[PDB]
Design a protein around this ligand. Structure first.
Ligand SMILES: [Mg+2]
Ligand SMILES: [Zn+2]
Lengths: 212, 102, 53, 217, 22, 120, 69, 101, 166, 55, 70
């Protein structure tokens, strides 16, 4: 038994039914929202509480897309009311073999961290650095040495906000990842792709015109 | 640990020789090189580009290097550029001028 | 019925005591199609402590 | 399907509707598998169009204890090299044991996840952002609910502590102006009992502050 | 199910359990 | 699972039911299957047919700086349907073009652009 | 119902579903699902089998009669 | 990949300008010499491409600032119609493609 | 160095008389003396009665009022604590020694179980919550500067103004 | 057995780059060789395709 | 009331020891700030009573530090 059954979810607006529940958040499987409040109210009272302006704002369709769940297809226009498989996909298909090359993460250092074993700098302060996933989660992160490179993290540290699009594309093959790596370093360090660095050998005339 | 065997032993000895070449004199040289040449860039090239790109000497450095990706033997992308010209596929087996099958 | 647009009234609940004087010191004649007719203190029967406990 | 060597991309397929049996089904929007179907009727077509998804969770979602964000137990239909028989078998996600240093509560936490969840957690900037971004039915783990409660509580505690130290700031700024000139030994104690601060503990951590500073040098 | 029964020949209605309840 | 072993658990049959499955199918497999009722080929998707000054008053409310070419024909996965004239109606592909054809029959000048076919 | 500060609300997600659900085994009310008339007349959202609003007969007739149709 | 033409609206992350990116017909890997592996993953990547370029890092060349990068954000056309309709006409000239009045 | 000495009839009799009675003036019961048989028992007995001899916080609070000036200063701060949060963390009904057991191991931190021990001050470096709510504090302060300077009034007044002009 | 082989190839390669046994002209075998000249280094340099697309 | 009251009691307790903590942190802050005004700036310090006492507690903390080091 249920004393006080909870009302339909997103129901705020006067003349229009709520979005289908489960598209707001809730249990999927039905394509039409319904509220007893809206329906039981006589048409004229619904009209009386509105204006032509307000009405044409909540009539408003955003047709294939959904509002409450950004970027996806609205379930009520999908063949079955459940949310789309493709955008919500699992990382591995039914037949797909698992080969996911070790991937490296952009990471912001909060302290100057010197590696003594290699006699070189792990990273400087406020320097984005690509590191080993395990190395980051297991060691840098539990100490306070580094946090993740997310844009809001730049925002909080005060630095100008950049987006590395970490794991937007997660490569399912080593060659796929070598391509991803290529474009990544074409963005990340572009000083390598400026024409002066391609010409390092000659900042001057040819090397055979020089001295001993 | 077999040594009396020729190719099992001389090969993995070749391997440990190679990998003990790396972290001793090789790896600090690779690191040192990567450091030294960025070092070259920023005091020679960058003064020009900062003046060019419409930034200061500082912000242009965080711009032109937005992250540090240092190449290590387990993480490297590629050894060499891929082949410019890929050779021409002939019909099935030494058929001329054409073949019915594939 | 939609040509009527009679005198809509809106209840604004300010979390402090002074709301009335404030809304009057704002000096709002109109929100530009609306033409606010008047401000008034809406007198409520003061609620007991049982309601908030 | 093109028999040419060079196929620069075109807006529409240049030679008319693509030849070949596989391209039939491709153009229908069905998987390349379909060319191996003996039963092609409505039911089978609908079945392999994948519109509806047949796969399941091991437990009903309220009882689900691990994080499978989108992962289902799927079933793969395979075939022996003796091809008269065709068998199917279930396939499960790779559950890696989640061990993450949670930032808001300072400690490691181990709540078992899937692969996809770990890539996700790196994507979201730490374990805790990953838990708080998700909501309710989204994270279907019970475990998730527990550490989410802890993360939240502890978070509001962080805020409490921030407020705390800002109060402290305002206090010492108020009494500083008062005892900023040297004045007298007795005059300072009036300030000390006016603000309810004890003498000897003030002495004690003045000393501990001294030791603190000279210790690192 | 090695071989399935012919279920299409039946209209969909629930038969009565043979150890019928009293 | 018994569905994998090809067991018929239908309730009118043995009284049982298959365990992994939805309890309510708003449309069953047959009418998910029929794409003709869903996708738009050969079918009208906007049922109301507007008079002249009706149409002109509808166009009246489209915001300037709008072209037709920016509203892609939605995929086949998506239902084809229209709300009639609602707020932001010009944003709905099917409503936009249905209206356009209504304007064509009515001799109403069509203010928006037309659909561009990009070519390599 | 118990009022709760919103940010804690997620641990109750299942509880909140059990309320909106019909109060029986769905088995018992299943018939609303099966015939076509009641698939339209009943709201099935998160398994609450509850009759939607419906006009009475004379309602419908005097509703159609003043449109002169 | 890919069987069907499709149009996308893409925003340059660096200068915030919207340019339109098209993806046309490229033919299937040949069915006569058959590779199950290529075909299947191309089918899944095809469904992936058909929707919003989900699993893809988009790499193009921006026109306003002319360089090749992936900062690109892909927009479903409604977000685009939001972006566009509230813009004053002379910044349309700046942010968008020629014409687009 | 490490001496754990079990007691007996005589040796307990004199040990307790010299140690807890002589040094600590501590007074044992019959049940106590029955339970005093080891060196851990005597030392944590004394430890127990000494720790219970210490003043509580009710006593500490009544020797130390919080001065009207002090609290009046804490009042005028832009921010006061939330301070209900403890009630929201999950409590489990189980044995105390199994909770002892899993925290004897590392089991206690595993399955979404986490132990709450109340802190005072934090690690501010790398702490996102600290940072973000702190930024919040900054824009709060600059907001109050905007209120005192008078622009608040002005922005609002021209909001009203262009609302009426439309 | 792929990853460690790859490792071998990177290490070996860097070694040969210190010791100058490395030839960058390997992918280009089929192409005609440019002019050896004092201004023409632009011809020998290996160009990133992306930066050609840029200009 | 039996259920709800022991709660608001706990809340009141926490507000109380919160005030207390504000005061303690305030002592600490006072400690380093006063130390700073004395060592970095000059001409000002406490009574030689407070100075001998401060020195004494400093020596005691230093000894506890030497012992807790090893
Ligand atoms: Mg009936
Ligand atoms: Zn750009």
């Amino acid at each position: 038994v249920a004393p006080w059954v909870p009302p339909p979810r997103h129901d705020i607006k006067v003349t229009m039914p709520p979005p289908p529940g489960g598209e707001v958040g809730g249990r999927f499987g039905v394509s039409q929202g319904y509220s007893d409040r809206l329906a039981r109210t006589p048409y004229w009272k619904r009209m009386a509480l509105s204006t032509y302006k307000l009405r044409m704002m909540e009539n408003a369709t955003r047709y294939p897309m959904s509002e409450h769940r950004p970027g996806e297809y609205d379930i009520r226009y999908l063949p079955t009311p459940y949310p789309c498989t493709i955008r919500n996909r699992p990382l591995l298909e039914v037949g797909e073999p698992r080969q996911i090359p070790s991937i490296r993460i952009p990471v912001i250092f909060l302290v100057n961290l010197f590696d003594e074993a290699k006699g070189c700098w792990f990273g400087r302060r406020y320097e984005t650095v690509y590191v080993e996933r395990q190395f980051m989660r297991e060691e840098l992160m539990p100490q306070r040495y580094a946090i993740y490179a997310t844009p809001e993290a730049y925002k909080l540290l005060g630095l100008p906000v950049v987006n590395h699009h970490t794991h937007e594309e997660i490569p399912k093959t080593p060659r796929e990842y070598e391509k991803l790596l290529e474009r990544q370093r074409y963005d990340e360090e572009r000083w390598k792709y400026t024409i002066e660095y391609l010409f390092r050998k000659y900042e001057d005339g040819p090397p055979e015109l020089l001295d001993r | 640990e077999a040594h009396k065997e020729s190719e099992l032993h001389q090969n993995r000895l070749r391997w440990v020789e190679t990998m003990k070449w790396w972290e001793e004199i090789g790896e600090p040289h690779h690191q040192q090189h990567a450091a030294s040449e960025w070092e070259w860039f920023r005091q020679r090239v960058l003064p020009a580009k900062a003046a060019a790109m419409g930034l200061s000497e500082e912000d242009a450095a965080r711009e032109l290097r937005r992250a540090v990706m240092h190449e290590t033997p387990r993480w490297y992308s590629r050894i060499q550029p891929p082949n410019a010209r890929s050779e021409i596929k002939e019909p099935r087996d030494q058929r001329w001028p054409s073949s019915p099958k594939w | 019925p939609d040509e009527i647009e009679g005198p809509w009234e809106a209840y604004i609940t300010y979390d402090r005591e002074d709301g009335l004087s404030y809304a009057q010191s704002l000096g709002i004649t109109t929100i530009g199609v609306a033409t606010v007719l008047g401000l008034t203190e809406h007198v409520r029967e003061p609620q007991p402590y049982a309601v908030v406990d | 399907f093109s028999t040419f060597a060079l196929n620069p991309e075109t807006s529409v397929a240049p030679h008319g509707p693509p030849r070949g049996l596989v391209n039939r089904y491709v153009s229908m929007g069905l998987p390349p598998w379909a060319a191996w179907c003996n039963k092609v009727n409505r039911y089978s077509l609908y079945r392999m169009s994948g519109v509806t998804q047949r796969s399941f969770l091991p437990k009903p979602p309220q009882e689900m204890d691990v994080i499978w964000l989108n992962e289902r137990v799927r079933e793969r239909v395979r075939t022996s090299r003796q091809v008269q028989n065709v068998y199917r078998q279930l396939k499960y996600p790779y559950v890696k044991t989640g061990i993450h240093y949670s930032d808001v509560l300072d400690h490691w936490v181990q709540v078992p996840m899937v692969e996809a969840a770990m890539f996700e957690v790196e994507k979201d900037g730490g374990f805790d952002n990953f838990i708080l971004k998700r909501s309710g039915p989204e994270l279907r783990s019970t475990y998730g609910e527990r550490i989410r409660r802890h993360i939240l509580v502890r978070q509001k505690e962080i805020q409490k502590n921030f407020v705390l130290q800002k109060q402290a700031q305002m206090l010492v700024e108020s009494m500083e102006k008062e005892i900023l000139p040297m004045e007298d030994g007795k005059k300072v104690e009036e300030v000390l009992e006016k603000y309810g601060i004890d003498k000897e503990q003030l002495l004690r951590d003045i000393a501990r502050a001294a030791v603190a500073k000279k210790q690192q040098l | 199910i090695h071989k399935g029964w012919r279920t299409w020949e039946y209209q969909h209605t629930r038969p009565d359990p043979r150890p019928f309840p009293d | 699972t018994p569905m994998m072993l090809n067991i018929q658990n239908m309730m009118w049959w043995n009284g049982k039911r298959n365990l992994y499955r939805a309890t309510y199918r708003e449309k069953t497999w047959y009418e998910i299957s029929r794409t003709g009722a869903f996708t738009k080929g050969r079918r009208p998707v906007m049922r109301q047919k507007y008079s002249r000054e009706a149409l002109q008053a509808a166009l009246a409310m489209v915001p300037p700086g709008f072209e037709v070419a920016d509203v892609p024909r939605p995929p086949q996965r998506i239902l084809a349907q229209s709300e009639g004239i609602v707020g932001r109606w010009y944003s709905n592909y099917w409503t936009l073009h249905s209206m356009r054809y209504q304007c064509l029959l009515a001799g109403v000048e069509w203010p928006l652009g037309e659909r561009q076919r990009p070519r390599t | 119902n118990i009022p709760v500060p919103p940010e804690y609300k997620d641990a109750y997600w299942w509880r909140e579903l059990q309320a909106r659900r019909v109060q029986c085994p769905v088995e018992w009310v299943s018939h609303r699902m099966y015939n076509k008339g009641d698939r339209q007349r009943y709201d099935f959202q998160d398994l609450a089998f509850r009759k939607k609003f419906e006009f009475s007969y004379e309602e419908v007739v005097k509703n159609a009669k003043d449109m002169r149709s | 990949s890919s069987r069907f033409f499709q149009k996308y609206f893409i925003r340059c992350g660096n200068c915030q300008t919207i340019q339109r990116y098209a993806k046309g017909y490229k033919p299937i890997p040949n069915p006569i010499l058959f590779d199950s592996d290529a075909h299947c993953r191309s089918y899944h990547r095809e469904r992936r491409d058909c929707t919003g370029l989900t699993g893809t890092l988009v790499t193009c060349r921006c026109d306003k600032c002319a360089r090749v990068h992936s900062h690109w954000t892909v927009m479903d056309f409604q977000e685009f119609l939001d972006a566009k309709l509230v813009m004053t006409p002379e910044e349309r000239t700046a942010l968008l493609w020629p014409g687009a009045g | 160095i490490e001496n754990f000495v079990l007691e007996e009839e005589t040796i307990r009799e004199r040990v307790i008389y010299q140690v807890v009675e002589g040094v600590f003036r501590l007074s044992p019961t019959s049940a106590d003396r029955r339970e005093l048989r080891s060196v851990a028992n005597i030392i944590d007995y004394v430890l127990t009665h000494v720790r219970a001899a210490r003043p509580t916080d009710r006593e500490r609070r009544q020797e130390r009022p919080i001065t009207s000036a002090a609290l009046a200063v804490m009042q005028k701060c832009p921010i006061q604590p939330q301070l209900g949060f403890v009630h929201a963390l999950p409590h489990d009904t189980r044995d105390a020694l199994l909770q002892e057991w899993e925290r004897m191991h590392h089991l206690d931190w595993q399955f979404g179980k986490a132990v709450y021990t109340p802190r005072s001050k934090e690690n501010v470096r790398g702490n996102l919550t600290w940072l973000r709510e702190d930024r919040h504090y900054d824009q709060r302060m600059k907001f109050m500067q905007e209120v005192e300077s008078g622009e608040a009034r002005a922005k609002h007044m021209k909001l009203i103004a262009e609302a009426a002009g439309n | 057995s792929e990853r460690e082989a790859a490792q071998y190839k990177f290490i070996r390669r860097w070694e040969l780059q210190m010791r100058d046994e490395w030839d960058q002209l390997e992918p280009f075998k089929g192409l005609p060789k440019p002019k050896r000249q004092f201004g023409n280094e632009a011809a020998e340099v290996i160009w990133p395709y992306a930066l050609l697309l840029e200009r | 009331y039996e259920f709800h009251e022991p709660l608001r009691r706990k809340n009141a307790e926490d507000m109380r020891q919160f005030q207390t903590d504000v005061i303690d942190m305030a002592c600490a802050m006072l400690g380093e700030r006063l130390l700073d005004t004395v060592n970095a700036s000059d001409t000002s310090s406490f009574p030689a009573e407070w100075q001998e006492a401060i020195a004494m507690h400093v020596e005691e903390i230093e000894a506890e530090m030497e012992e807790v080091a090893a």
